[PDB]
Every structure is written in C-alpha cells, then in structure tokens.
Amino acid sequence: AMSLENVAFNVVNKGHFDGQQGEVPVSIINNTVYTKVDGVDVELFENKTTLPVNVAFELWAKRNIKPVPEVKILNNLGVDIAANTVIWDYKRDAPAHISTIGVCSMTDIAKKPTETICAPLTVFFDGRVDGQVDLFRNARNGVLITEGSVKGLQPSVGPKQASLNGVTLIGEAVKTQFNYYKKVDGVVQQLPETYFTQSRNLQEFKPRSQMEIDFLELAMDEFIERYKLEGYAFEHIVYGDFSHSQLGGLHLLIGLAKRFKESPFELEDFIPMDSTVKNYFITDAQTGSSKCVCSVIDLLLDDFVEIIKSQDLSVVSKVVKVTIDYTEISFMLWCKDGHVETFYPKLQ
Amino acid sequence: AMSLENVAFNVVNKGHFDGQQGEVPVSIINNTVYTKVDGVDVELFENKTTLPVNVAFELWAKRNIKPVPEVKILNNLGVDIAANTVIWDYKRDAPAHISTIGVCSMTDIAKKPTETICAPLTVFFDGRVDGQVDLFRNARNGVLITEGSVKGLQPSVGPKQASLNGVTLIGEAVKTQFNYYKKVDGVVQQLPETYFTQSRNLQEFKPRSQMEIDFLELAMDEFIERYKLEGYAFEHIVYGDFSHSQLGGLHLLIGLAKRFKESPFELEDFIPMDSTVKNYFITDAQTGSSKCVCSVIDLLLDDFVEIIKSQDLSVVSKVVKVTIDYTEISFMLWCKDGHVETFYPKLQ
Amino acid sequence: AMSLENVAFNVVNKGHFDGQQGEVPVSIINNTVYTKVDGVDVELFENKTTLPVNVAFELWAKRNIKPVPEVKILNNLGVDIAANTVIWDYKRDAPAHISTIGVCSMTDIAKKPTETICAPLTVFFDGRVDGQVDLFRNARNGVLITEGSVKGLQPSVGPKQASLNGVTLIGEAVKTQFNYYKKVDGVVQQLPETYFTQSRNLQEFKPRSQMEIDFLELAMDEFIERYKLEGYAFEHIVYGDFSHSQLGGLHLLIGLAKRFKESPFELEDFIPMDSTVKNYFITDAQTGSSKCVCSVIDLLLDDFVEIIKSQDLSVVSKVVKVTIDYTEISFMLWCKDGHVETFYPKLQ
Amino acid sequence: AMSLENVAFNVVNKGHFDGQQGEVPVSIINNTVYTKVDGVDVELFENKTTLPVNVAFELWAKRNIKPVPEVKILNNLGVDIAANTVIWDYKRDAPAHISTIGVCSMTDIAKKPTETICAPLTVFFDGRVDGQVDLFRNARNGVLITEGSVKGLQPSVGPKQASLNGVTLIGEAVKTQFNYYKKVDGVVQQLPETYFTQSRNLQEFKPRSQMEIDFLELAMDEFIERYKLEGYAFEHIVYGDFSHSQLGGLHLLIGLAKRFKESPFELEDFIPMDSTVKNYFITDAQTGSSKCVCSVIDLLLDDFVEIIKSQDLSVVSKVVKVTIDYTEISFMLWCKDGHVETFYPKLQ
Amino acid sequence: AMSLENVAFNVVNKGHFDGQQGEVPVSIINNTVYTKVDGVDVELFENKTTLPVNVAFELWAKRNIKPVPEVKILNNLGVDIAANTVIWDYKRDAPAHISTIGVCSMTDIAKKPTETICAPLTVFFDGRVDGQVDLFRNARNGVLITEGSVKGLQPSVGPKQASLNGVTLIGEAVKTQFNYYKKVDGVVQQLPETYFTQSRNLQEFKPRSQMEIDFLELAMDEFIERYKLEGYAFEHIVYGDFSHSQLGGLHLLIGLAKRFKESPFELEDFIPMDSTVKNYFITDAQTGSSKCVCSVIDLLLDDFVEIIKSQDLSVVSKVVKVTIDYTEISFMLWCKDGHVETFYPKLQ
C-alpha cells in the first residue's frame, strides 16, 4: 500500500524509505513537501528535478543508501536504469535515471528486470542484493557490481571510491571497491584497462602519493627537476599560466588545489553533472586571468605523469585517447621541437 | 493603515517593520517580494513558508527583534500563539505559530489576547512589554517570560541563552535569561526542574566547563580515566564507534564536535526544525560508517555525566525519563553485568 | 538566427553566448532552464530575475565577460542601459539594466544606440569595443569607459578595481582601471573629484596601507595614539561599541573585519544590491548588541582619516557631503566641545 | 534548425508548425508561451500537459491537422507512438503519446520508425503519407490506416468519423473512414468484428437512423411499442428513471440527449479522457435524482437494440462482452423471469 | 496612500478603483489575488498578463470604465500610452499599454503627460476629461478623442462603436462615436479617409444595412442577382466554399455568421488580440473543410462591395491597399478574364 503519506512517515521516522507502516499529514506546495509537526509545517523535500514533486520525493526517499558507483562511472558504462533501487545523483539533486524497475508506480516501466521492456536497456544490477547476479546473467543488457568473485565471469576491478549518501569515499567500515561486469546484446563485454579519476574536491584536497605531496610542498622548478618533467609543459598544463588575459593550461585538479591554497578563484560549473572531465568558467581573483571553458580532470598526478611521458612528442598536434573511468577521453597533444607545448582534455 | 507597500517601506528604511509611514513600489512574483530601486527590482523577501507570500512577508517584517526564547523551549511549553508579536522560526524560515493576535489582518484570530477565541490557546506573553504580565494573569492558558520578579508568581529560571534575530546567544549587552511561568485551564502550573540543552553548532562549538575542555583536549582513554567513566560506555555513546557499517552511538554534540575537528562527516537534518533532541542521517566521510537516525542532544558534558552516573545499572533495558528544556526526554538504557552498553535518546 | 536552443548550445559548449551555431534540446520548468545530457535533465540556469525565465537566460548568457565597472559605479553615474552588451549584476543575480540595445529581441528598445529612442537614456559605452567611443560622441546621454586617451575628452581616472564575471579585482593579467567620461543633454560633463570604495568582503579582507595593517594588528588605544586620532571618536565610529543593547557606530568595513577575526556577527543585507554605502541589520553573536540599520562603507582607512580630520568640529550637528564613487554621500557629524561624538553615513 | 522562436514564428504566421523559416520574440512565464506583437505580449499557448511548457508548445504546434483516428480507437488498438507526427489529444489538451519519432528533440526516441527502439512499440502509420504503408509492411508492431486498398492485406473498415483539429466529424470534403490494419510480432492480425461508438455530443446530437429519429420524436410508450422492446427495460436503461434519489439507468447517450432537450442536468466528467465508455457523476436539475458513476456509451440505438436482443435472459446476473471500437467492453446484464432488469457498461 | 489592500478595498466596495479610503485583508498565491470575507478566501483577480500579479491587479482595478476606443483603433493610430488612465485590453486580459502616466507607481513613467519622457510617445488624451484637450494642444505626439468640436481643429469622425468594460457597443445612453485628432512632432495630422470594421460577433451578429439583411435572408444566387455581383466571386470570398479539403474563401464575418446559423464550425483564434483583420484556423464541422489561416474582416457588406467594385480586374494578381480603422490593410486580388477569382486580407 504505497502512498505519499507513507513515504513521508518513513522519511520522518526512519530518515529514508524503509518499508515501515504508517502515515503523516503532508502538504504539497509548488515543489516542496511539508509535514505537520505540532500544528506547523516542516519542509521534508524540495524538488530540484524535472519530475512531479511527489514523484521526486518518493524516488529520493527510495534512494540507495549503500555505497554505490559514482554516477560518472554508471554513465560511462552506459547504464540506463537500475534494478529495484534508485541511484540518487547528488550532483544534480535528481534521480540518475529517468525510469525505474519495481520502485515507484509513476516511474516504473516494469516490476522486475526480466520483463521484455527492460531487454534493450542497460540495467544496473547489485550483487549485494539476493538474486541480482542471476538477473544479470538473464539480462540482455546490464552492468553488475559485486564485492567478490562471480563464477566464470571475468571481473574488472573498479575504483577504490564509491558514493554513500552523496559522500564519495574509500570505505573502511564498508566496502566501496567493486568488481564490474557489463553485457551488451546478450554478450558479456570485456571492460577496458582504465585509469580512474580520484573524485577529490578543491576545498579538502589531500595528496595520495609521494609525488602529489612533493607537488603540493615543492616550488614548481624543484618539483619539475625532481620528477624529470623538463619539456612536458607542466608549467602550463598543471601549474597554470595566469600571466595573460586567457588563463593558460590548469587542467589537473591538484594544480587548482595548489593555486587555491595561495589565492582564491571562481569556478563556474556551467554543466553541473558528475563527469570524468569537468568544464569550468574559471576567473582567477588575484590576476583577472580567466578562461570560459577550462577542462579539469582529477587524475593521480603519477597517472598523469605516466600518461604524458608515454607519448611520442614528434608531431605538431594529435588526438591522444586514454581510457579513464572506463570511457575514452580524447586529449589534444601539441608539441614543438620534441617538447610538449600543451596537453588537455579535448573540448567537443 | 496597514499595506504591503507600507511593510516594504519599513523593511527598506528601518530594516524591519517599525510602524513608520511611507510606501515603496512592490512587485510580487511567485514567492518573492521585490521593490523598485532606480528602475530595477531588488529582492526583499523569499517566502519559504506555507502562507501566502505577502502574508509571510508581513509576519517576517513584524518579527520580534528582542532576544526571545528559542522555539524548542516555546514548543516544549506548549505555546500555540504569541500576544501582539511574531516569534520568527529561523530554523524553518517561517513563523513559529500559524495564527497571530494583533499583528496581521490575514493571520489574526484576535486583536487582543483577552478575546474569548484565545482562552483555549497557550498564549506567549512577554513581561518586557507593558501590560503583558496582567494579560497573563487574565489568560486561561499562557506562558510568560520576565526579566524579574512577578509578585506572588513562583518563577522557573530559564536557559541562559535566547534567540536574537536568529542568533542564539548568552546576552552581555542584553538580558537573555528569563523567568518562565505557565498557566493551564486558569491555573498556574509549577514548571519541572530541568536541564537545558546548550544550543551549540558543530562548526563553532566551544566547551563551557573544565570537563568539556578535557574531553576536547585529552585522548579518549585518559578522559575516561580522569572522570572515572569506566563501565559508562562513553566509547560508544559519546566518542562514537565508526568500526562497523552502522555508526555506533555518537549521541552527544560535543562528541560530534571532537570527531569533526579530525575528519568531516555529513549530517542530513531530514526534519529541519528546532528541537531538544535532533535526528540526523549521519555519513562519516573517513570510514563510510553511517546511521539513518542518529539522535543528537547538546547537553553540557557534566550534565550528561551526572545523568548517566545517576542510573541503576542492574536491568538489561529500561526507559529513563530526564526533564530537558522543560520536556520529558525518554532515553533507552541498556546494561550487561552492571556496566552500560548504550544510553540514547529513545527513537519514537 | 537567435533561439533558446542556440543560446543553450553556446552555454554548454562555450560557457557563455559566443555566437556559435548549434542547438541543444531544452526544457523550461518554472524558472529553470535544463538541457538533456544522455537522457537526463541538467540545470543550466535558475531565473532569480523579474524577467521571463527564457529571456533572463539569454541576457545572462550574453553577459559581458570582460572586466566592467562595478554596478554601484554605473548606478552612481546614472547609467540606464548598455550599448550592445549586458552588464550582469552578480549582487542581484539579474541584469543591471531593464532594457537592452542590440542584445535580445524581447528586451531590445533598439538595435543601435544611434536610434532616437536611446537619446534620453544614459547609454554605457565601452571604448574597448570598435566604434563605441564614436557612438559616445554622437550620443545625447552616455557614460564611456576607455583604457586610454580619447582626443580632446578630459578623463576621470576610475577605481583600480572592476568586476570580471562577478569577481571584483584589481587586474594584473587584464586592465581594470578605466578612464570615465559622461555626457548629459549632448554636453560632456566634468566628473567630480572623488574617493572610491575598496569593494572588499569581510571574509577575505586585506589591508591596503600601513595604516590599515596597523589598525588590524595594534590594540585600539595604541592605533589611536600612533595616528593622533584622540577626539575623532574612532572608538565608536570604527571599532564599534558593543556595550549597550543598540550597537554603537561600526560604520567602516575594516572595523567589521577586525571584530570578525575575534567574534562572529550576523549582517542581514535587507536591500541586497551593489551600493557605495551598504545598510545591514547587525547582530553581534558574543554580546547581543544589535542595530537594525547599520550603515557600512569600505573606505581605505587613510581616506576616512583624511575625511574626518578635514572637518570643522565646532557645531553640534551638521551634514557633511563627501564625493565617493562619483556620488555625493551625506554623513551626519555630531560634535561636543570640539571633539567628534559620531560621524556616520546619513540614513535617508 | 529547431527552435522555440521558429515554432512560435510558424504558429503566428501559419497557424501551426509548417516548416517555415523565421523567428518571433518569445516569453515563457509559468505554463504560458507569449510573443511580443508591437511592444505587448500575446498568449500563444497555455500548457495543460505534464511536459515542460516549451516542449508541449512544440508538440501542439506539430499536431496532425488531417482527420486522424479518435484517440479512443488508437488506445483500443494498443498504439504506443506515431510515425513522424503528433496525434494531439484534444480531450486531455495533451499529446496522445508520451514519445515521438522524428518530431521533437526533447521527446523523440528515434528519427525513423525503422530504428530498433521502435520495433517492440505499436507504431501508428498513415497510408496518406508517402512511404508509411511500406514502413508498416516492414514494421514488427503497428497500426496502419489507409483511404483505400493495400495489395495483399484484408482491411477492417473503421468508424465513419475521425478527429480534425479536435472536431469529430464524418467527412464530406475529406475522407474520415479509414481501412485499419494491425501487426503484432511481424504478423498481420485479423481485427475482430466490432461495433463503433458514434462520438456525438449532448448539445448537437443528431439521429443517424429512423429508429433514432423515432426515439427522439415519440413518447417512450409509443417507441417501445413500435420497436417491440417490451421486457428489455429501455424505460430504465435508455430513458432513465429520475423517480428515486439514485438516478436509474441512463447509459445510452441518445437517452441523455432526449432528457437534455426537456430539462438540464450536470455531467461531471471526473476522468476527462477519450474512451469508448465514459463515466459521469450526473445530477438531474429538475428532480435531484443523481448517480456518482453513470456509465454512458454512444451506440447507434439500432446497434444497442441488436446487442440487448442477442442475449440470453435466463440468469439473474452475468458479464456480457461486446467488441466496440475494437476493444472488449464488459456489460452487466441483470434479468428476472426472462425480462431485462438492467444492462450497463460494467464499472470495473 | 497607494496600497494593494486599498486597491482590494475599492474593488470589493466600488467594483473598481474609485479613490476610496479603506483596506481589506489580501492574500496573493501564484497569479491570484484573494480577500478574506468572514474567515474564507474569495478570488478578486487572476493575472493573465506578463506583469507581476499585484501590479496587473492595480492596473485592472484602475481601468477606464467609460466607453473608450477599441484597442485595434488605438494601435492603428500608433498610441503608445494613455494620459492618467488605463485602457484595459479585454481581448488579451491585460493592459493595452506597457507603461502608465499618473496611475500606478510600478508602471508610471511620469505623473503628467507634460513630463519630457512623454514627448516622443504618442499619448492618448480624452477630451471628456477636464484639461486633456489643452494637454493634447501642448503635446508633441498624441491622439485625442472628443464628443464634440475642438476650436481650430478639423475632426476625423471615428467608428460608431466603442468598448465599455470590454463590451463593444454603439451607445444609446452614452456617446461611443468620437472625433479623432492626431499630432506627430507638434503638427496636427490630417487623418486619412478610412472604412471602419463593425466589431460584431458570430453569435450575436446583426445586419446594419438592407444589403446585410438581404444577404442573411436570401439564398446566395438570389442575393448575387439582386446586387449584380456576378463575376466578383462572392460564392468563394463571402459565402465560402466547403467542397474541398481546404475551405475556400470565407473572409467576411457576415458570411461566417450566415454559415454559423446553418452549421457550427471551430475558429481557433491563434493570435488572440484586437486587430482590424483576424486570422483563424477554421474547421467546418459539417464538411471537414478546413484552413490553417483564414483571414476574416468584419466590414459592412456595402463597404466590402464598394471596395471590390472599385478595383481593376485586368491583372492575374496584385496587392490592393485599403485604409481601414485608420491603418493600411493589404488585400490580394486574383482575377482571370476580367472576373475576380478571390480577394482576401493578405497573410503577410
């Protein structure tokens, strides 16, 4: 017996939908859900989605509260829909997926992923839930996560981090590193060898290697000397050039982190979604150097160094393809006289 | 001559409603009030309430700008309505009470609290306003605050802190510690002996006793030794256990404050109102330990220590009732072999 | 071929309107613009203006992304409208001006500023754009900025700072200090000699003179002694008096900055627009001292000292007029026995 | 080059989307689309759909303006989606189908019905459009209408009436009677024998047989005698019984039409959609006789008489199934002593 | 003392704004204004304009309640703004003009039409209001109506009809036929000779000449014979041709009125504004004959006959220009062998 008032009862009493019986009085006004506590209205939910307020409220209440893959990983693997859960996208304040399976009468296209409507969709399955590995084996199209071996299925070791109630973290009390599997058109697909983005924020950035500690602590010239980076244009690509009206380079999050400690800047996140590569309109507060589309990726600096040192430096310009978060990220590499001029995630 | 434009004139010229004459041009669009300053619209108010935008604007403009009791105290004393003022609830961005007396033509049930409609309501009276102690004596149901003695009325000394324009503070330039009195059904009611919550935030938490300084400065084992807390399960209740998927204990704000200095965590305030006990959906960023309903109370640690050491430790489970902010807070106490296992504000 | 979908294409691909060809799918719901990225809606813009959502979106996308004068300067110079650009007011999240010239089919009153409808409007012209100095010479009413000499036009050297994508800054990689010129009724107007406000925030306040370093570092009595300020009431005007229920003085931002480092306070910006003088409803957290209308100006302390020491101290009360940001700011000066009692921006 | 402004231009200049180049200025406010005509706003569209206002506007503009099957026919034949058109549902003021093919970038799941996502969907094909008969021949699942014979397919002769811009009519200047063909999983179906509803209104009801002429002109007793309808309870079922608090019978639109000529009544259309059977909350103004759910069907009276005279009258109650508008309509037939008591579309 | 509550008081007590003192309690929710009557909310106004709800409410309340020129007349004469009144546009449910003079603080650009901002605007002046003839005499740009002669100005005799509270009528108890005068750049214009539209409705159409009486009463062939209209294609242009899928002709309202008596049709008013020529998407219910853009004008039939009989019938196609309601209306005239084929208001 699903009901708005039952969803609200669960949110008030359990902090999320927990299948408990009960009802509280609700008022809906515009995109806000309220409940009456002792004669006054208390806000339970503000709809930021393109769904109806009461529907969004239910999907949010029914959000997966276990560690789940970051939405950028799901998107990069082509996930269309989840089996019997909601992956809440905390970057969009909205469901990661438009439709559901066995969650909500307004958004369900099916009660179970075995229904024929689901066959052409890439369904996300969670091996931590009884039955879902089997549903994956039966599905035409899917992505599966597990905490361990699945007999006969060749695994891909995923990122260390996952999202737990919108907090990206490397679990200590809980497991966040999953095996991944994918099927297309009834056929298990070998996932590519990949780097993973580190999913750090500017404000709480922490180095995760001696090389990153050195980059944050050393001055530019000593770091470049110590790690033999002469001719790799880290002065432009990583450290950034704030000397002209157009901000030069600055494509690695650690480089933004180092600048940020010294002087503040504005990052306008003009397409605010989770993605392997982020684009910001950056305005440097100290200098007034700015750039409308500054592509930024959070690679471990050691991974970026491995990538750039792996490149042939003998052509003027070429597209370099690097597998990151399971997706092919195109970089533009510009060279002159066997040194790098710039290397950036290629703007589409 | 009350008018939207007159309310707006007061907000622009006086920073709140101050009974001054004058008008400014206003535009209302959706839930926002704007005024025209030199040919452009400037936002004066965004309605977050369930009232009409123009009505909410007026109540907010007419908010009490003296120190007033925190809404949790008023709610715990059963206050329904205020005499000739608006207690603005800065935690809900809304009026603390649905109706008014002598404030606003849309929300007034009466011009004066002596009207018979008010008799069954618990009316909040403010002895700092001429006439209101007398109105309390005449009222069937009420709560009264004063800065001093009321002849023949036995006082209750309230919390040290009050709310001044949404800032909870212990007044130095102004008095925030009131005498409280309550009447039910025409009869003055003896208020119970009570502890008071300290109303601190995680971000700006300051200790208020040598014991709290010690808790914040010492390591866990030395604090527990120094204050003879062996067998009282402070390791679970106060310090918190982040070792399992479900976060253990962590029910005292000071304990959250100590953790917060070391590593960040998310507190989802899923019923965002003022209350003696708060419930959060907590996600620890470092460990991934989490709990959907983590009850948190900000007691002076000395008061909590007094409370828990006062308990008989010889039953498995029992409900312990403690008067806090004038209300009966139920705690669950779980013991084994004469030591505490856990002691938490009982989830309803 | 202007279109909502073309505006959205530019925002997604270029971070702002850049005249590029292309379209993306858009959804408008309430005041929010979304675009479809891989089957889900991503928010591009939330309308906070009194214009239609799609119109506001276009003006914002077409915002000037060069350093431009702070809106308070434009307003103080009487600017009504801009030639062929949008000055976005980041303090109001709205266009600085109601109408446009050659920007947007819904808001344009003209395609070019030479149209007769523009003659009575003070049009903002930007000498960094080809043709606009000539348009200024032809305009009946206008304000012109340039980076250099305009033959025969007597310049006014403007503030050091300008606004670049809502960041107020003194440019190092870009020029933010302009020459200003104004015309009224076909006649070039001599701009007055003026001080300029420094446009600092409380949170990131930095001193810009030895005197400001001294004010922030010294104790009150040594600062006043060192700078010979006995009898100028800096104890009240600058440092502020938190000893009574009404907060005394505190009219200079540097004084708020010094207090802020010690103890937090609330500033309610109840008319949130850019202005030379700002009015706050201030609540001091430590003391409970408050003031409904606290006028605050960010003058270099040396400029304020020059201003107050320039005054005749022999009348009880008088209005003192000071040109600041090109506008006449009225101050009330109250004296007793040849010493200052108070000196504040006069509340209108 | 698809664009809100281009859709608006077509609506203003062509009365609907007609693929013309051009732009008009548009404003969107709440669910309304306006265009500027000589400096004032003129309403073009009010969104009554659950889609975004600008999307609904485009699908409306792109509505099919030829006679098309009534939505109830399409729904009954299981049509999911239309090939390269929008069937506008004028009963719901909304698109008949969730998704589109080759119409609108926000709603399209495909550009052509040959794409694999369309294979499981019952696609509507219109033989009046070049290529669509052949697309039906290649489609796995579809419904096809034609004005004439299709080589190698036996037709089902459809209703005489079709919908032209929300006007249901029997064409004299245009053809409204289609051949129907349907395919499920690649197999041409033999559509069942069916009656058709007549799609008439109460206010402009016209008889379409001599029996209907006689029913409207004669008194009940004369009509029942002429057509030998003794014992078939037409007094109840068709004429209606307004003698008790609950209105008896009245399940045939012609009987509502007859009452309506004599005295008015209220029909609350509480599920306002196109359906073979309609349910109304009916209140008779003359008598006060009412019924919460009065099922009403517009059958030619001769067809209804054929149906009721083709039943076995020997059981107290049973379900009678009748193919109408290609769907199975359940009636309840209640009999006593070999005569009808009532017969109504089953409220199930 | 202008105020939302005072406007509401006037609406409740005087049926419109009448300058009376008083206040009622108001609530604004979305675009609706309500007032409280004995504890319940009663709707006073639903905003259909692009202005803020409270502003639209005031301009509506302050509407001109005397007979005033139809908006199409004012628009055709180039009126920008009205002197000290609001011409309410009942076709758009919105003010006829963007701005006001001496009406409303939000919309006023001036208090008096003598202010310099009004000099370039064509201001509407009403000689029925003391002082306005003289204000017209002093105005650079205006239109003036009067009931009688103005010393030294030759009048243009206007239409017989005017709008009184959105009812277009020819006054018997009040004067609706005005003298018109217009000034451009300080010079009294000689207004052109003009026909006038008759502003009639389909539902209450009344003939205003013996020719119109005859057109309504006689069969097409008798009428055409009586008035010698052979070869002028009235069969097509006026009577309409419902024989083909595209509805032929039907451009004269009297011909729609005649059809409408026999059989109903749908007229979609897809640009719902007052204009000399109206465009309808017409669907004939009897035949299914339809046309996306059917231009319709309500000329006295005698005037239309004079116009068509005053053209040269010797070319295949040309533009015929006719002054109607003071504006230049373009018709397309198509001829063959010296007879008319069609003649219609040009869809341009």
Residue numbers in the entry:
A (entry chain A), B (entry chain A), C (entry chain A), D (entry chain B), E (entry chain B): -1 to 346
Sentences from the paper on this structure:
The NSP15 endoribonuclease enzyme, known as NendoU, is highly conserved and plays a critical role in the ability of the virus to evade the immune system. NendoU is a three-domain 34 kDa protein that was demonstrated to form a barrel-shaped hexamer in solution by the assembly of two trimers. The oligomerization is mostly driven by the contacts of the N-terminal (ND) and the middle (MD) domains, while the C-terminal domain (CD) carries the canonical catalytic residues from the endonuclease family. In terms of substrate specificity, NendoU of the coronaviruses is described to cleave a great variety of single- and double-stranded RNAs in an Mn2+-dependent reaction, by hydrolyzing the 3′ end of pyrimidines, with a strong preference for uracil, and to release 2′,3′-cyclic phosphate and 5′-hydroxyl ends as products.
Here we report the results obtained during the fragment screening campaign against NSP15 NendoU. For the fragment screening campaign, the chosen crystal system was obtained in a citrate condition and hexagonal space group P63, containing two NSP15 monomers in the asymmetric unit arranged in a dihedral symmetry, which can be symmetrically expanded to reveal the full hexameric form of NendoU inside the crystal lattice. Over 1200 crystals were soaked with different fragment compounds or nucleoside analogs, resulting in 997 datasets collected and processed, with an average resolution of 2.2 Å. Despite the high concentration of ligands used for soaking (100 mM), as well as the large amount and high quality of crystallographic data, only 26 crystal complexes of fragments or nucleosides (2.5%) with NendoU were obtained, highlighting the difficulties in identifying fragments for this crystal system, probably related to the large solvent content in the crystal unit cell (74%). Unfortunately, the NendoU active site, which would be a primary target for the development of a competitive inhibitor, was occupied by a citrate molecule that originated from the crystallization condition in all refined datasets, which resulted in a small number of binders to this site.
